[PDB]
Amino acid sequence: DCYCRIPACIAGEAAYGTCIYQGALWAFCC
């Protein structure tokens, strides 16, 4: 699964895109 994250993706994940949600840019991490 993937998750929007701030400020970064967790160990084991990489960024594949972005989320925009409650006025901020999130990392989309899978």
Short mmCIF file of C-alpha atoms in Angstrom, two decimals:
data_model
loop_
_atom_site.label_atom_id
_atom_site.label_comp_id
_atom_site.label_asym_id
_atom_site.label_seq_id
_atom_site.Cartn_x
_atom_site.Cartn_y
_atom_site.Cartn_z
CA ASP A 1 0.00 0.00 0.00
CA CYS A 2 0.89 3.69 -0.34
CA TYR A 3 0.38 6.61 2.02
CA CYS A 4 0.57 10.35 1.91
CA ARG A 5 3.28 11.39 4.38
CA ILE A 6 4.84 14.55 5.76
CA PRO A 7 7.74 15.22 5.90
CA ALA A 8 9.13 12.03 4.19
CA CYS A 9 8.54 8.32 3.44
CA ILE A 10 9.38 5.72 6.07
CA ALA A 11 12.23 3.23 5.99
CA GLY A 12 11.50 0.79 3.23
CA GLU A 13 9.23 3.15 1.23
CA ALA A 14 10.04 5.40 -1.77
CA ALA A 15 8.15 8.45 -3.16
CA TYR A 16 6.05 7.89 -6.34
CA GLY A 17 4.04 11.10 -6.32
CA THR A 18 2.29 13.68 -4.20
CA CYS A 19 -0.94 14.35 -2.33
CA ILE A 20 -2.59 17.67 -1.77
CA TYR A 21 -4.64 17.57 1.33
CA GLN A 22 -5.54 20.07 4.08
CA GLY A 23 -3.50 22.82 2.34
CA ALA A 24 -0.18 20.98 2.27
CA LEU A 25 1.90 18.93 -0.16
CA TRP A 26 2.36 15.35 0.89
CA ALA A 27 4.78 12.69 -0.34
CA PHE A 28 2.96 9.77 -1.89
CA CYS A 29 5.01 6.79 -0.66
CA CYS A 30 4.75 3.14 -1.66
#
